[PDB]
Amino acid sequence: SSNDRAWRQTQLKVAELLIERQPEVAVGYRLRRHAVWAGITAVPMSGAGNKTPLAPMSADMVDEYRAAMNAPDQGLWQRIEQSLTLAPYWFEGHRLSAEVAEKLGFGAVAQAIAEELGTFLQRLPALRELAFSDGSPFLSPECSRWLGLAEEVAQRHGEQGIAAALALLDERIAQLKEPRDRFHALLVQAELLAQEGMEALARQHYQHLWQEASRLGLSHWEPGLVNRLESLAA
Amino acid sequence: DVDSSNDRAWRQTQLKVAELLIERQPEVAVGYRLRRHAVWAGITAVPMSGAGNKTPLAPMSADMVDEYRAAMNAPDQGLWQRIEQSLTLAPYWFEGHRLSAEVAEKLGFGAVAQAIAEELGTFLQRLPALRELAFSDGSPFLSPECSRWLGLAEEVAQRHGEQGIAAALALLDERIAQLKEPRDRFHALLVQAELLAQEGMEALARQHYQHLWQEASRLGLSHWEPGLVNRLESLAA
């Protein structure tokens, strides 16, 4: 905090020079974000109904940026990009900065911004629903949209209920005649249930499969399956 | 550490900065990406080569290429700084970037290895010739092993159709080289068969189907995946 100012400053120039030298090259833009966002270890505290004390971006200053957007240049993009070093949490600005890059050809950069925003939200997911002291939310739905069977049956468990996930696994299994398929089908139910909370009734399927496999001799053809079934049944 | 400008100092800047974005937080993507920019953006054009895409550039020291292949079974931060230190003094040794990401992977920095492969990913989109080039000793910058790093029947009938039967088999080789599960390996042979026949060599194929239909039986594949086994039969007769 004492010596970690310069180190945040340093990173900035080094990105500034990297961007001046090459506005098409993203590695500079990417270093800026690390100077702003790596300081932040845990989200902002938010009292009455998820509202942080943090001041939002002056409505008149953001009116400018949407006004100029229909006719943009390298100047505009820098002031926007400057603003978002001061207002870390203004995620509607990263979206705008990306559209500015997008209309000034720099696709590679545009993409690299999104990826860095996501990289941050994948760190402190708590940011996806918070709001500025004025109520306007950190992440607009406009801005939030801006970003086999083991995939499908484990999908439906995350969305609708588990009973639909099994109703799903069920309808599929009536359409499978090769027991290699069905073995994997039953293998899916070991994972779907183990990720539900049930550690016991799942463990008693890794047993009825690890035996059932070794017994089928798949240790001598596809032993990744078998050796992973093993350490799981335990 | 002050920042300078006059190209030679800017390199040394970007590197002394990269050393710290990494030493203070080795799980972070950007630290490594900066090191990449510091070493390859200087390069505006591919080096020169004529005698069959052979540049004057000498590849990595033989002793040193084994050493890194060997210590893989012991992936510590001591190794991962040297693997790096090299791709930094040898701009083109792309195999060291597959290693660097393989070691990161083992060390648990999944986003690190992911980015390492995106920086090299783009560096090649800007200087494509860099794929077809080779060192002094005909060794390629980009090994096919290293290239995959950046379903199979479908793909071989492709290559067979585009390049030739020669080049289909070529592929099917380096594939198998890194297919360790017997069921996989077994499919490749089934492909090679089909490939052979797709050409018009009925017999050497049927003689290959036959060998499969029994090797299938021998292992008990009717009592597990019997559709494979039934075609092999209608094929081998």
Automatic annotation (TrEMBL), chain A:
Coverage span on the entire protein: 228 to 474 of 478
Stated name of the protein: ImpA-related domain protein
